[PDB]
Ligand binder design. Structure first.
Ligand code: ZN
Lengths: 211, 55, 159, 119, 97
RNA sequence: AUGUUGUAAAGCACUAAUGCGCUGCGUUAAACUUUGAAGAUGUCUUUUAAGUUGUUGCCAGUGGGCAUACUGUGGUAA
RNA sequence: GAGUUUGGCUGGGGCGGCACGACUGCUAAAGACUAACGCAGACGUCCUAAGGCGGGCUCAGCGGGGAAGGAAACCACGCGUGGAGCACAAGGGCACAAGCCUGCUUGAGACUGUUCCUAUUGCGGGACUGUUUGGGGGAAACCCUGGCCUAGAGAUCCCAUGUCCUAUUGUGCGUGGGACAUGGGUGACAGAAAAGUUACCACAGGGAUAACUGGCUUGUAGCAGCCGAGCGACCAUAGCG
RNA sequence: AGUUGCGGCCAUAUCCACGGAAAAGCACCGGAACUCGUCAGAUCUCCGAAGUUAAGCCUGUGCGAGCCUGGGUAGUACUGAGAAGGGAGACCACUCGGGAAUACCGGGUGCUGCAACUU
């Protein structure tokens, strides 16, 4: 029947993961977490837009699958297929239970059985993130606004000052990219420190000038 | 029928009335099961115990 | 929850990360005497002669020495009173206690100058310690060490 | 004694007192002890308890004010002062903390403008 | 369980070690002149039926195994108990490494 | 003065999980721990502060509890 | 035809299960103690070696080689912190070892005392000493009183066997009695000798406990909102969602 | 000043690459009648002294991997003791106290005991 959402909104103290004492758990409903072009280079998509949490609560696996379709379809219609990269950042590890009173036994023997899955979420945690070009800014702020109508509670949308999916501020990444200390291969990056052999250090400079 | 099972409520208040007292250590003539090597030098072994637990 | 002898000791009786292996040799060369204070501290690699988990981390006083073992006396609380207990422990689960180091080097120097005072006749026993008192006085100067001018400093946020 | 005062800080008010207010306590509300028995502070009862020592009330006040190593015997000789309520009231919730606007805790050197209305 | 048929061990008569033979010990007959059986038999005469309870509600399959150690000189015996052991064998055919 | 501890938080060094990019970025734990508090808990010294009990006789009632501040467990919840 | 019996726990009782004796990890909030028909499992055995001791060795796995030879046969070099094994549940422990191979053995001897779990307390299971006209292994230091450690457990009364004593008017005995130690068993495991039915029914009580109303709750039941993918010949909102 | 024999604490001592080394030592090294042990004198056991510093042992080097100790992260997270504070709740705030942890940066790389021997 799928009970209403208010029955499993708030966090228990401990998480109840699927592992070897549990064994009877249904499969997760979201299976894709990375959409868009997804192989673009780190220099291509400089802008980052997040959706931040203002609650402590569970996020259903159904609500995460419904918000992903809603946000992908808008960016494909207004931005273009090869113009963004979208990422889900949660993974529902927690398992929910039900006590299943079908004249039965009542509160006698009431430890319940596996029911569904959810992700646990805390104050100021990101939920969805998008990296794109500086011109498709208003398309990304409008796609995420439509998708948080799928979630319970309050959430905020912010435009960040970090560089893409690097976890690094925009002006620190820039002055390390001019000194030739960033190795940029297809999809990922890497920094070069002054720490090892001097010979090994100078091959890295040659990679970072070509690759 | 079906009632409560267990509680430790009020049990610290009972244990603390009149203080929680310590006995005194014995005088080395009261210990049993001593080794024969200590039964030889019994006079100057009692000096070490009796002067440490009553110092 | 059941009540075997080694009940509920998964973390208490364990080695501590790159400190595995059996007892080292200096642990057999220590010399124990009647009246010493000792710490009980289980080594989980030695199976024989070990005490019950209640006594791990307690300090006791020696009253007898056997060819491989010691007898220790100490106090245990049982809901409203204390009781004396007699433990038998092998030499591998025991170490000397440093719990009287402060009090012994202070009582030593006291009798030291007492002999050095009777040599001169002028003596005096009372040398009690005192707790730390209120505060003495200060004469702070600003010829160097110029002040730094601190304050409330408006609030900033970065995301 | 500073640690012991951290334990009872939500029930008392403590702080520092000067010398003109300390003389006004002992002369107005002071008594002695013969061991559980309360005796009046005369010059003759004071000599019998400190034989070759203090003989007036003003000497008791000047050992308390300094350290003077007779502090412990002079403070045990006194009986606790029993005061009145303050004329005017407290002006606060009074079970709130002093730095938060109440009357309980450390008044450090402003304790005199509560104690002078209770004597 | 497989136990050998001979053993060297201490004899309380010889007061040293010697060779013994091993087997299983068992219960003999009860005799009717011991005072307990005398008492139980006069109580069951006449009218009244069963006096003295008898046990139902049993729970046990095994008995302790008790050995008989018989010295080949002086012919002195002593008994010795072991654990539960459903099956017992005294001959041998040792299991080979 | 000198010993004991493995929780909260955090983390990936072991056990069990989890998306991508072809070295990095992303997500987890009552029955995971490389780390690790606040708090608790042993012993010595009144030759530290502040304060001012030991031994034993004859005997009663009681062994359905409940509320709350903070803190857990089961339950959609009460 | 007579007399009598036909346990208990329990989100009412009954049916079912055993949370009724007992071991490991978690619930448990960094000393110890701590509840639920809370979670995940295991117990009523097995072993003359799978017990004791001396010596010699190294395991899971990976890399490069070798007639028939292949995904898997056996020889053999270079590495391998245990990523393997150790009767069984789980936790702890272990590398010239507690693992593998091998030699000899019956300490799985006879007695005796102190102490822990553990108390106001029995039984049980462990630890540590002493005494022997006593063993085994080893050149020797040294170790050994069952199983690498934490489970595998049974009173009073009666009977069977062994050692030391004994029956009061005296002496014996093919007739008995005792002290101590082991075995025969009570699993509802501090331990009665025990089948049902009553709608023909009785008595002492119980709101400590059900079958109707009220009260707290809202999973289910009923009635509503928000979003905007689609539909509506065109056209997200005429109506739908 | 070192090496060797027997050690205590058990990585600041370990692991990987190159180099150095006067005198002694420690080795590698030549053999199998006896002792002892193997499929095999490879290992183990006995008897030796022609040769060599090639290795082992000991010492240097490296913006080396690890380990040890500091800084930053940060008065942040969490938290002991209080009060008729706010909020539908989830939870947030205030007063007096205590106070962590990766990623990043800097510096270090065995210390000692008893004995014998070496220009
Ligand atoms: Zn014999």
């Amino acid at each position: 029947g799928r009970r209403p959402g208010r029955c499993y909104r708030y966090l228990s103290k401990k998480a109840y993961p699927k592992s070897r004492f549990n064994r009877g758990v249904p499969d997760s409903k979201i299976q894709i977490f990375d959409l868009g072009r997804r192989k673009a280079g780190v220099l291509e998509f400089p802008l980052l837009v997040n959706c931040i949490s203002n609650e402590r609560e569970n996020l259903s696996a159904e609500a995460l699958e419904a918000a992903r379709i809603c946000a992908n379809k808008y960016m494909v219609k207004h931005a273009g297929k090869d113009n963004f990269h979208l990422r889900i950042r949660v993974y529902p590890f927690h398992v929910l239970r039900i006590n299943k009173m079908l004249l039965q036994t009542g509160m006698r023997g009431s430890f319940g059985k596996p029911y569904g899955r959810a992700a646990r979420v805390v104050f100021n945690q990101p939920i969805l993130s998008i990296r794109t070009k500086e011109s498709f800014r208003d398309a990304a702020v409008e796609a995420l606004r439509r998708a948080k109508n799928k979630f319970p509670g309050h959430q905020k949308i912010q435009v960040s000052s970090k560089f893409g999916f690097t976890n690094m501020f925009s002006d620190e990444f820039n002055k390390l990219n001019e000194s030739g200390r960033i190795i940029l291969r297809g999809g990922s990056f890497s920094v070069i420190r002054e720490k090892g052999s001097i010979d090994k250090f100078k091959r890295d400079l040659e990679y970072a000038a070509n690759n | 029928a079906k009632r409560k099972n267990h509680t430790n409520h009020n049990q610290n208040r009972k244990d603390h009335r009149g203080g929680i007292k310590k006995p005194k250590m014995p005088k080395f003539s009261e210990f049993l099961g001593l080794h024969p090597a200590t039964l030889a030098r019994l006079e100057e072994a009692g000096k070490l115990w009796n002067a440490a637990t009553s110092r | 929850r059941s009540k075997g002898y080694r009940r509920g000791t998964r973390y208490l009786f364990s080695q501590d990360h790159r400190k595995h292996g059996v007892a080292h040799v200096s642990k057999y060369l220590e010399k124990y005497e009647i009246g010493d204070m000792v710490d009980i501290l289980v080594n989980p690699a030695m199976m024989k002669g070990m005490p019950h988990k209640y006594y791990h981390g307690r300090t006791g006083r020696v009253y007898d020495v056997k060819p491989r073992s010691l007898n220790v006396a100490l106090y245990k609380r049982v809901r409203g009173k204390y009781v004396i207990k007699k433990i038998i422990v092998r030499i591998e689960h025991v170490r000397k206690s440093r719990c009287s180091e402060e009090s012994q080097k202070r009582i030593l120097m006291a009798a030291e100058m007492a002999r050095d005072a009777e040599s001169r006749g002028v003596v005096l026993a009372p040398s009690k310690r005192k707790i730390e008192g209120p505060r003495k006085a200060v004469e702070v100067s600003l010829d160097n060490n110029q002040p730094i001018e601190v304050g409330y400093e408006p609030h900033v946020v970065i995301f | 004694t500073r640690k012991m005062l951290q334990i009872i800080k939500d029930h008392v008010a403590f702080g520092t007192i000067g010398m003109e207010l300390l003389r006004k306590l002992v002369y107005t509300k002071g008594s002695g002890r013969n061991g559980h028995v309360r005796v009046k502070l005369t010059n003759e009862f004071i000599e019998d308890m400190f034989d070759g020592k203090i003989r007036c009330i003003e000497e008791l006040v000047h050992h308390i004010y300094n350290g003077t190593e007779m502090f412990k015997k002079v403070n045990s000789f006194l009986y606790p002062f029993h005061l009145s309520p303050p004329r005017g009231g407290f002006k606060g919730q009074k079970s709130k903390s002093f730095n938060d606007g109440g009357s309980v805790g450390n008044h450090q050197d402003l304790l005199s403008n509560l104690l002078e209305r209770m004597i | 369980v497989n136990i050998p048929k001979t053993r060297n061990t201490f004899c309380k008569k010889c007061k040293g070690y010697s060779a013994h033979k091993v087997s299983q010990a068992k219960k003999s007959k009860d005799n009717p002149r011991a005072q307990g059986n005398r008492r139980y038999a006069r109580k069951q005469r006449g009218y009244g039926g069963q006096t003295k309870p008898i046990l139902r509600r049993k729970a046990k399959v095994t008995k302790k195994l008790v050995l008989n150690l018989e010295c080949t000189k002086c012919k002195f015996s002593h008994q010795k108990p072991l654990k539960r052991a459903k099956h017992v064998i005294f001959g041998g055919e040792r299991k080979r490494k």
